[PDB]
Amino acid sequence: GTSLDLLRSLPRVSLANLKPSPNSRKRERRPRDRRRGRKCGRGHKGERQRGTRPRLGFEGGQTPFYIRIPKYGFNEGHSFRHQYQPLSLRRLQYLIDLGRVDPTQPIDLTQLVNGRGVTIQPLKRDYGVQLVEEGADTFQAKINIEVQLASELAIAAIEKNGGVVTTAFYDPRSLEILCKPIPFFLRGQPIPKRMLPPESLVPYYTDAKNRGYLADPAKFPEARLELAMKFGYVLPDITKDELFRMLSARKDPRQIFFGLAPGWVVNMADKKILKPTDENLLKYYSS
Amino acid sequence: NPGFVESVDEYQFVERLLPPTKIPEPPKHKHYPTPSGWQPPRDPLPSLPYFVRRSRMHNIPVYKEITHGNRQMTLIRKVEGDIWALQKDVEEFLSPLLGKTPITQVNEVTGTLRIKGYFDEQLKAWLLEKGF
Amino acid sequence: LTYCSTRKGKRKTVKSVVHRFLRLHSGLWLRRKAGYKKKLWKKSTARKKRLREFVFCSKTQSKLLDKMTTSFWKRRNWYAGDPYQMYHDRTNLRV
Amino acid sequence: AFVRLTLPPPKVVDRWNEKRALFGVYDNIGILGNFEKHPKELIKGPVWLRGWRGNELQRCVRKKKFVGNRMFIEDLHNLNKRISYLYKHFNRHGKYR
Amino acid sequence: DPVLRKCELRIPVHRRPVQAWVESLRGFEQERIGLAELHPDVFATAPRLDIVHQVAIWQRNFRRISYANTKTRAEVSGGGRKPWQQKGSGRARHGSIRSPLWRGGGVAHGPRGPTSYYYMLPMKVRALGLKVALTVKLMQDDLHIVDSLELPTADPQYLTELAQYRHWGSSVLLVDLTHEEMPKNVVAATSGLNSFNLIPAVGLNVYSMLKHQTLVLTLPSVAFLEDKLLWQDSRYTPLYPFRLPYSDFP
Ligand SMILES: [Mg+2]
Ligand SMILES: [Mg+2]
Ligand SMILES: [Mg+2]
Ligand SMILES: [Mg+2]
Ligand SMILES: [Mg+2]
Ligand SMILES: [Mg+2]
Which residue among D24, D34, D60 places its CB closest to the CB of E250? Predict the structure, then answer.
């Protein structure tokens, strides 16, 4: 624009002409002068001028406020409670529209992470993502998605458009590998197995109404229909759909990645995969 | 005999896992506005003196901000050309709603415009009409 | 408190605060009432009801409690089934 | 006060010697080099403060961790005494609580 | 045969490109041999001198380590005993001959040990500074795009006279694509010159551009610089260090 024309007229830019942005630096004040010297802002002789006032929270000898209030367990066990990041249907629809997630293929945590759709902190006790009903009315996509937790209304929205949603469990060690797979391959170790849910979480993941990954497949057809009746839509049949194979794809309950089995080694340097030939090893991984 | 057998066929799944470094360009849609609400810049470009560019995420750069805990403002950021012309248009567009001329700041060095009060939704719709 | 620790050079949390108060992400703090388990036989029915409640803290108490805890206790927590999910935010507040 | 009675000998500075001419080269090694090296790895100095900064108490404790076991007896005695003095100043004294 | 170059990357529709004369060094009069186009987003950014100030100061300060030191009253030799008793003497009260008040005593507030000044500016900010510096040289007519650095003779005098002939500055910075393949003739001529400096493309920095009056870029380096800087725009944040494998990044 016109600004660059000004440069042509003005003298050369050099190390003798530099200037900071105005107001970017304040002035630091030393106690030399009369305004800021003498008593130097500390007051008259006492404990505070000399520099030895009591600590924060001390009230002069009466029992302090933060210790006269009774103890109660608001934060008991906080470091052991499980955490799930929320993913709303507004956010999911937004991501598909801009092309940062590919709806043709199945969607799992790895694909969500790779598109910056979600940020996962395993060291802060994140165990995965839960689908949230907000934005359900305007969801107009057909997809295959796997999440750790789901809500009643969120499941309805996905399926009404002819899609599949399922709930799956990952352990702390597996979750770290899932989010950042490439650094694991650089280590040179075999892929580990996936542990089953703790005892308390077994009822949730073996229940059809939750779309669990360990529930009886025979009972799914009944559950899907009842949602259609309750929320007033017609249950579509996906077997007719051309993409039935994609929508039906599901991984083994002891598998982390779709096309890879426990016990394999990924040699990324020369694009090869190594498999063990020992019966004891094969039996261990397959169990 | 070695204990490992090497196969090259299954590496395709590993290739899927690789993450990208560049933001993908949005995909073409038959019907706009897109179900979320996103709408791409219109073609041909507007002929106004000032041009407003989009962010790396392909959104209109209008932001709500606060300071001191009680001062509410809205910001239009990536302006090229004559920033002063844009100020005149914003004052005319917003003046009837307020009942007074809005208070504004123009930053020529950073090419941004700052307005007192929250007017992000109206400005976003207003800019789309002009087709930036 | 410890402003600069020997081993890491960081501030330290006062753990007697963590055992007595709850912090909502907006900046509020919750507590109980002193004496809510003591000599209930000599307290009226209205007096006992007031004791059972959860109560908020003043501005000066909130300021002091913030200095005595580190940032880790001030983050966003996403607990499934949280019974305080609706109290972490403010609505219709002009201030 | 007393002042010089003669002018000091002149100082002549060569502004195009090798050190001055090539100052700054390779400060963009990462962005222009595909990020194989971080610019901090270009720094020369004490082992315990390469690519790191801290206050005096932090510097003293960091020095002990890196080379504390390879130090002379008397130097180590003084370092330990400095740490305890700085600990009591930064945790018990000052205007602001 | 004009040498015409086009930007490989996509120029924004609303921005017209900018151009400069291609030149050669084989002769004293081969000033113009071609015409070239330069991406507007690199060579036509806004003229921000505050950012140039920041990057220049970062370069100078992030390396600094000061070795100034002083002894406290604890580390000076001697000083253990109380000199005389509190009362009777009629002198001022004193407890050690090595306090700051005494001649030969310790220093109360002096420099302490080796100290570092390290800090890092955000990567996008440092990349932006390079674009602004390149823009400034072009708009002020201090940039000269060249096809190659080949020279007829290795005599240092020839290069100096050429700079006088074409109205160059007293100090010239010359950039070539890579260190290993730099032409033999150029290396011999520059090595004996204080003010004419030869560096590879990866060594370009804001500080050297300010120090040297005129910049000389070969065409292959222009494509090199354009690629790296424009990548910083339209990228994600890093999931992990960029040196690790990525789908589409070297
Ligand atoms: Mg000071
Ligand atoms: Mg988080
Ligand atoms: Mg002593
Ligand atoms: Mg003694
Ligand atoms: Mg004494
Ligand atoms: Mg001395």
Answer: D34
Q: Is B21 helix (H, G, I), strand (E, B) or coil?
A: coil
Does any CB of chain C come closer than 8 Å to the CB of residue A110? no
Compute CA distances A186 → A180, A265, B26, C3, E118, whole Å.
11, 10, 32, 40, 31
Centre of ligand 2 to C-alpha B82, Å, is 41
Distance separating alpha carbons of residues A259 and A201, to the nearest angstrom: 27
Secondary structure (DSSP) of E192-243: T-SSEEEEEGGG--HHHHHHSSEEEEEHHHHHHHHHHHHHHSSBPPPSS-TT
Instruction: Please give, rounded to a whole number of angstroms, the shortest distance from the CA of E88 to a CA of chain D.
Output: 33
| Chain D: closest CA distance from residue E121 (Å) | 11
Beta strands in chain E (DSSP E): 3-5, 18-23, 34-38, 65-66, 115-116, 143-146, 172-176, 196-200, 214-218
Residue E136: name the closest of A4, B53, D40, A198 by CA.
A4
Q: What is the amino acid identity at position A85?
A: Q
- Kind and range of the H or E run holding C45: helix C45-51
CA distance D97 to chain C (A): 9
Q: CB B45 to CB E234 under 8 A? A: no
> Do strands E143-146 and E18-23 pair parallel, antiparallel, or not at all (unpaired)?
parallel
Q: How far is the CA of D86 from the centre of ligand 3 (A)?
A: 16
| Sheet order of strands, C29-31 included | C22-23, C29-31, C55-56
Query: What is the spatial distance between Cα A86 and Cα A211, in angstroms, rounded to a whole number?
Result: 18
CA distance A63 to A96: 59
Q: Give residue E104's region: left, alpha or beta (phi > 0; psi -120 to 50).
A: left
Which helix (H) or strand (E) covers residue A275, if one does?
strand A272-276
- State yes or no: chains E and C have 3 or more CB pairs below 8 A: no
- CB spacing of E247 vs B18 below 8 angstroms: yes
Contact (CB, 8 A) for C67 and C2: no
* Alpha carbon distance E7, E223 (integer Å): 8
Query: Interhelix angle for E184-191 vs E156-165, to 10°?
Result: 90
One-letter amino acid of A50:
R
Q: Solving technique for this entry?
A: cryo-EM
Neighbours of ion ligand 5 (CB under 5 A): E 95
CB contact under 8 A, B21 and E48: no
Partner residues linked to C55 by β-bridges = C31
Is the backbone peptide bond immediately before E83 cis, with ω within 30 degrees of 0? no
> Any chain C CB within 8 A of the CB of A16?
no
Residues 6+ away with beta carbon under 8 Å from A136: A89, A153, A154, A156, A157
- Resolution of the deposited coordinates, in angstroms? 2.9
Work out the widest C-alpha separation in chain C, in whole angstroms: 53
DSSP E188: H
In which element (H, E) is residue D18 found?
A: helix D18-21
| Cβ–Cβ under 8 Å, residues E170 and E176 | no
Report the separation in Å between the CA atom of E101 and the middle of ligand 4, taken as the mean of its atom positions. 21
Least Cα separation, residue E247 to chain B (angstroms): 5
> From the CB of residue B30, how many other CB atoms can be counted at a distance below 10 Å?
4
Ligand that comes closest to the CA of residue A120: 2
For residue B74, how far is the Cα from the chain centroid? 13
Contact D45 E116 (CB under 8 A): yes
Calculate Rg over the CA atoms of chain B.
23
DSSP letters of B48-85?
SS-EEPPPTTS---EEEEEETTTEEEEEE--EES-HHH
CA of E111 to the centre of ligand 4 (A): 29
**Residues in chain E closer than 8 A to A113 (CB atoms):** 239
Residue with tokens 């400069």, as numbered in its chain: E20
